Amino acid sequence: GSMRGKVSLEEAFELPKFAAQTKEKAELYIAPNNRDRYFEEILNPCGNRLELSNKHGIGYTIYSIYSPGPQGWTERAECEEYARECNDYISGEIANHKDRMGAFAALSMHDPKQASEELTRCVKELGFLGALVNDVQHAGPEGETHIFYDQPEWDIFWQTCVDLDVPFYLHPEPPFGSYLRNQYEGRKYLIGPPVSFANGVSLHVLGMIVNGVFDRFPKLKVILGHLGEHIPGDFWRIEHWFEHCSRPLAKSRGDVFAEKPLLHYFRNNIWLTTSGNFSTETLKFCVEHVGAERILFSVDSPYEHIDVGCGWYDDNAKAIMEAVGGEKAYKDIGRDNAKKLFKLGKFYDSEA
Amino acid sequence: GSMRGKVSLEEAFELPKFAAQTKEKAELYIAPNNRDRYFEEILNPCGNRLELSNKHGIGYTIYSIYSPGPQGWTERAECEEYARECNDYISGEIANHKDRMGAFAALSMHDPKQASEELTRCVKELGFLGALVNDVQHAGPEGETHIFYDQPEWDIFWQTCVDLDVPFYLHPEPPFGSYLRNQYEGRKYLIGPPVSFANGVSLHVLGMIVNGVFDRFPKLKVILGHLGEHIPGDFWRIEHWFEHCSRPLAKSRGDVFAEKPLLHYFRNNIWLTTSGNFSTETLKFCVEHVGAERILFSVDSPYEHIDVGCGWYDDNAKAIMEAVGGEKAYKDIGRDNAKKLFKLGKFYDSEA
Ligand SMILES: [Zn+2]
Ligand SMILES: [Zn+2]
């Protein structure tokens, strides 16, 4: 049947002093009847969301800054101070619940050296378990500069991730600037989970692949939410296009291109979570391609409801077991894959 | 178990007088060893691609303008003249092979009424079978203006599609303007099939859904290539988000929103093709969600090779039949779904 001790690791917060900014996210992502709960959860890591996690059989929650978080702060010095404030805040909150809470670093991604230094501080001094970054870092006096991490200057940062041996969770963020105006103004309800989020993350991680990040750093670990941000349904089409067009075309120009097949990266460097994607059928398709050991349960609180995400995994245990290859695979996805990936010791309900 | 008489309907051409424009497409989409074949095929609807189609068991090819085609022509008067020339040209070419060739209208989509009139001319006077439009119509310097068809003025055009009772094929196109520079300059090999194409089409058709196009025009027929442009893998997540967030939020503001579940539109208004997606596993997943009667074989020539797409469907007939639910489903996908959708009479090998 169902299990306790599940690990959930796409679980967002904001600094309480910025409560007013969370009402702006609520207007993008939260139905009216869910506003009271959203505001309580996003501002209280140890509040009712912890009680729900305990009731619903979560053993370890890894908290991260919400979106865009620092990636929406276009002034470098202000962005760097905010990221540090987020890390110091969540470190203080999780200190009282070490058996069931951890955190991922919030980072200013304006400068690779500075981001590497803050990640190192979070991991070595605060015991954080990785980084979670909300897609491209926006920058410039009017915010139009889009900083992607698949360019060579970011190699110092990837080297830091590998040296610390912690994963990088690439989370989505809403559209900004001319992209928001040109492509979303007339379909604003498509901002967020319906399409815009995965459109951005898939572009960015495929960018890391085709620009050779994982070839230069074969030990690098990256996590994608939402069962891989559109990519698994296109595993065949993307790899086929790389074989039929992209690889020989790039080679003919002397341009950098990924050295391995698409699935190699998804079987060695990338892990997927079930955040906001409580779909047994989609989970099955993903398992069939990447392996049950490469998918991690997660909720996506507070944008999703802990009781709903845990309810799916718990209440459909038998059907999910059939879909993912048996009892061990089900416990691996629920808990044991993440326990091993994050090198967690004993934690709440971890052997239950 | 293979069949002849297959229908293939994402098969592109360019006007011979614009041969020079095809070189820019080759630099985006065609490996060096495939250039000679691409140039021959894109400029000769009755050339070797017809010989290959006859050899490989295609009974009916529906030709369409390549991409962006008119959607990249930013000046309305020139765009309208080009679309007319494309339609008159392809009408003349297919006249010599009526038993095995048809066409979809090329349209200037600067003005809903003007596009409606050209579609009517193509259907009523030239016998065309629908329209194929390459995503948003570009206008303005560098194409920075993006004209989407999910805004209320486009109801004039949707009413025309319903009056004529023909489908609208929403095909992808490359990025333009600031989006091209900001989001693709550092990952240029992701322009096209790897991600950019489906990112645009999925945004656009989901836009039509959430702005209520299919609620006001429940008889409207739309076709998507590439097994649905990322949407099927996200069927659960999109509909869940619409239920949990978007529909109650829009209702609370009095904003228009899709009245029915996402899968209703994919089971009533939208058909998928296999263009560029010769994946038995992805096809199976789509069949399980939308029904085998809603998926149409297609190749995507000349960007894909007719021998490769037909080779997949023909050589793996037994495995595909098992994946899609049996012989009738296999013949439906190969031929009979399209025969019925486009009301084709007898055609070459149509009872084979
Ligand atoms: Zn999230
Ligand atoms: Zn095509």
Residue where the block lists tokens 């263009």? B275
How far is A302 from chain B, CA to nearest CA, in Å? 12
User: What is the Cα–Cα distance from A183 to B200, expressed in whole angstroms?
Assistant: 9
State the pairing for strand pair A101-103/A131-133.
unpaired
- B1-352, CATH topology level: TIM Barrel (3.20.20)
Strand partners, B137: B147
Which chain A residues have a beta carbon less than 8 Å from that of B285?
A: 233, 281, 285
The half-sphere exposure of A75 on its side-chain side, counting CA atoms within 13 A, is 5
What are the strands, taking DSSP E only, across chain A?
A: 6-13, 58-65, 101-103, 131-133, 137-139, 145-147, 168-170, 222-224, 270-273, 295-296
User: What is the Cα–Cα distance from A204 to B301, expressed in whole angstroms?
Assistant: 29
Which method was it determined by? X-ray
How far is B142 from chain A, CA to nearest CA, in Å? 13
User: What is the Cα–Cα distance from A227 to A286, expressed in whole angstroms?
Assistant: 7
Cβ of A194 within 8 Å of Cβ of B238? The answer is: yes
Cβ of B199 within 8 Å of Cβ of A199? The answer is: yes
- Give chain B's count of helices (H) and strands (E): 18, 10
Determine the residue of chain A that is closest to B225 in CA distance: A237
The yes-or-no answer on residue A336 being catalytic is no
| Packing angle, helices B306-315 and B48-55, rounded to 10 | 10
| H or E stretch at A320 | helix A317-324
Cβ of A249 within 8 Å of Cβ of B150? The answer is: no
Residue A252, Cβ neighbours under 10 Å: how many?
11
Strand partners, B58: B6
Residue B315 CA, ligand 1 centroid: distance in Å: 43
State the pairing for strand pair B222-224/B270-273.
parallel
Strand partners, B244: none
Cβ of B241 within 8 Å of Cβ of A194? The answer is: yes
What are the strands, taking DSSP E only, across B70-171?
A: 101-103, 131-133, 137-139, 145-147, 168-170
Residue B121 CA, ligand 2 centroid: distance in Å: 24
State the pairing for strand pair A137-139/A145-147.
antiparallel
CA dihedral sign of residues B64, B135, B268, B3:
positive
Question: Quick one: DSSP state of residue B188?
Answer: G
Which residue among B240, B244, B281 sits closest to A236, beta carbon to beta carbon? B281
Where on the phi/psi map is residue A225: left (φ > 0), alpha (ψ -120 to 50), or beta?
beta
Contacting residues for B153 by C-beta, under 8 A, at least 6 apart: B112
User: What is the Cα–Cα distance from A286 to A270, expressed in whole angstroms?
Assistant: 12
Where on the phi/psi map is residue B268: left (φ > 0), alpha (ψ -120 to 50), or beta?
alpha
Six token digits for residue B182: 């900001």
User: Dmax of chain A from CA atoms?
Assistant: 58
The protein residues having their C-beta less than 5 angstroms from ligand 1 (an ion) are A 10, 300
List the one residue out of B106, B101, B109 whose CA is nearest residue B58: B101
Residue A124 CA, ligand 1 centroid: distance in Å: 25
Using CA atoms, how far residue A72 sits from A83, A91, B297, in Å, is: 11, 22, 43
Which residue among B206, B236, B304 sits closest to A190, beta carbon to beta carbon? B206
Question: Quick one: DSSP state of residue A271?
Answer: E
List the one residue out of B317, B265, B323, B328 whose CA is nearest residue B293: B328
> Is the Cβ–Cβ distance between B147 and B134 less than 8 Å?
no
| H or E stretch at B63 | strand B58-65
A308 exposed, middle or buried (CB, 10 Å; 0-12, 13-18, 19+)? middle
Six token digits for residue B168: 């609208």
Residue B336 CA, ligand 2 centroid: distance in Å: 21
A20 exposed, middle or buried (CB, 10 Å; 0-12, 13-18, 19+)? exposed
Where on the phi/psi map is residue B192: left (φ > 0), alpha (ψ -120 to 50), or beta?
left
Residue where the block lists tokens 């439906």? B332
CA gyration radius for chain A?
Answer: 19
- DSSP for B71-83, please give it: GG--SHHHHHHHH
Residue B251, Cβ neighbours under 10 Å: how many?
13
What are the strands, taking DSSP E only, across chain B?
A: 6-13, 58-65, 101-103, 131-133, 137-139, 145-147, 168-170, 222-224, 270-273, 295-296
| Packing angle, helices A306-315 and A317-324, rounded to 10 | 70
Which residue among A202, A278, A285 sits closest to B285, beta carbon to beta carbon? A285
Residue among B111, B135, B300, B349 flagged as catalytic: B300
Six token digits for residue B144: 């920075």
User: What is the Cα–Cα distance from A321 to A333, expressed in whole angstroms?
Assistant: 10
Which chain A residues have a beta carbon less than 8 Å from that of B183?
A: 146, 179, 203
Q: List gaps in chain A by the residue before each (C–N > 2.5 Å).
A: none
User: What is the Cα–Cα distance from B283 to B273, expressed in whole angstroms?
Assistant: 10
Six token digits for residue A244: 């039929």
Phi, psi of B289 (to 5 degrees): -100, -45
User: What is the Cα–Cα distance from B216 to B241, expressed in whole angstroms?
Assistant: 22
> Is the Cβ–Cβ distance between B282 and B324 less than 8 Å?
no
Cβ of B240 within 8 Å of Cβ of A281? The answer is: no
Strand partners, A138: A146
User: Dmax of chain B from CA atoms?
Assistant: 58
User: What is the Cα–Cα distance from A280 to A288, expressed in whole angstroms?
Assistant: 12
Cis ω before A70 (30° cut-off from 0): no
Strand partners, B139: B145
Which chain B residues have a beta carbon less than 8 Å from that of A202?
A: 195, 199
Phi, psi of A104 (to 5 degrees): -105, 140
Phi, psi of A143 (to 5 degrees): 70, 15
CA dihedral sign of residues A240, A241, A244, A250:
negative
Residue B12 CA, ligand 2 centroid: distance in Å: 7
> Is the Cβ–Cβ distance between B278 and B333 less than 8 Å?
no
Question: Quick one: DSSP state of residue A123?
Answer: I
Strand partners, A63: A11, A103
Q: List gaps in chain B by the residue before each (C–N > 2.5 Å).
A: none
Which residue among A248, A257, A276 sits closest to B33, beta carbon to beta carbon? A248
Residue A173 CA, ligand 2 centroid: distance in Å: 30
Residue where the block lists tokens 């097994």? B227
**Coil, helix or strand for B281?**
helix
Which residue among A190, A203, A248 sits closest to B195, beta carbon to beta carbon? A203
Residue B10 CA, ligand 2 centroid: distance in Å: 5
Cβ of B234 within 8 Å of Cβ of A146? The answer is: no
What are the strands, taking DSSP E only, across A16-160?
A: 58-65, 101-103, 131-133, 137-139, 145-147
Using CA atoms, how far residue A285 sits from A32, A273, A298, in Å, is: 34, 13, 17
CA dihedral sign of residues B309, B310, B315, B317:
positive
How far is B37 from chain A, CA to nearest CA, in Å? 13
Which chain B residues have a beta carbon less than 8 Å from that of A190?
A: 203, 206-207, 210
List the one residue out of A280, A160, A135 whose CA is nearest residue A220: A160
List the one residue out of A265, A138, A140, A243 whose CA is nearest residue A200: A138
A146 exposed, middle or buried (CB, 10 Å; 0-12, 13-18, 19+)? buried
Determine the residue of chain B that is closest to A236 in CA distance: B279
Six token digits for residue A26: 């609520």
The whole-angstrom distance between residue A155's C-alpha and the CA centroid of its chain comes to: 20
> Is the Cβ–Cβ distance between B146 and B122 less than 8 Å?
no
The whole-angstrom distance between residue A226's C-alpha and the CA centroid of its chain comes to: 8
Cβ of B242 within 8 Å of Cβ of A278? The answer is: no
User: What is the Cα–Cα distance from B196 to A194, expressed in whole angstroms?
Assistant: 16
The half-sphere exposure of B88 on its side-chain side, counting CA atoms within 13 A, is 6
The half-sphere exposure of A132 on its side-chain side, counting CA atoms within 13 A, is 26
User: What is the Cα–Cα distance from A35 to A40, expressed in whole angstroms?
Assistant: 9
User: What is the Cα–Cα distance from A67 to A72, expressed in whole angstroms?
Assistant: 8
List the one residue out of A157, A108, A114, A169 whose CA is nearest residue A137: A108
Q: Looking at this protein, which amino acid is placed at residue A245?
A: C
> Is the Cβ–Cβ distance between B73 and B79 less than 8 Å?
yes
| Packing angle, helices B76-94 and B112-120, rounded to 10 | 10
Q: Where are the domains of chain B?
A: 1-352
Using CA atoms, how far residue A60 sits from A121, A290, A291, in Å, is: 22, 24, 23
User: Dihedral, CA atoms, A44, A48, A51, A52, nearest 10 degrees?
Assistant: -110
Residue where the block lists tokens 């080679």? A251
Phi, psi of B255 (to 5 degrees): -85, 145
How far is B300 from chain A, CA to nearest CA, in Å? 12
What per-residue string of b and e applies to B80-118 under the rule 16 or more CB within 10 Å gives b? Answer: bebbbebbebbbebbeebeebbbbbbbbbbbbbebbbeb
CA dihedral sign of residues A203, A269, B231, B239:
negative
User: What is the Cα–Cα distance from B83 to B75, expressed in whole angstroms?
Assistant: 12
User: What is the Cα–Cα distance from B141 to A178, expressed in whole angstroms?
Assistant: 14
User: What is the Cα–Cα distance from B241 to B218, expressed in whole angstroms?
Assistant: 23
Which residue among A186, A233, A288 sits closest to B207, beta carbon to beta carbon? A186
Residue among A111, A135, A300, A349 flagged as catalytic: A300
Strand partners, B147: B137
Cβ of A230 within 8 Å of Cβ of B198? The answer is: yes
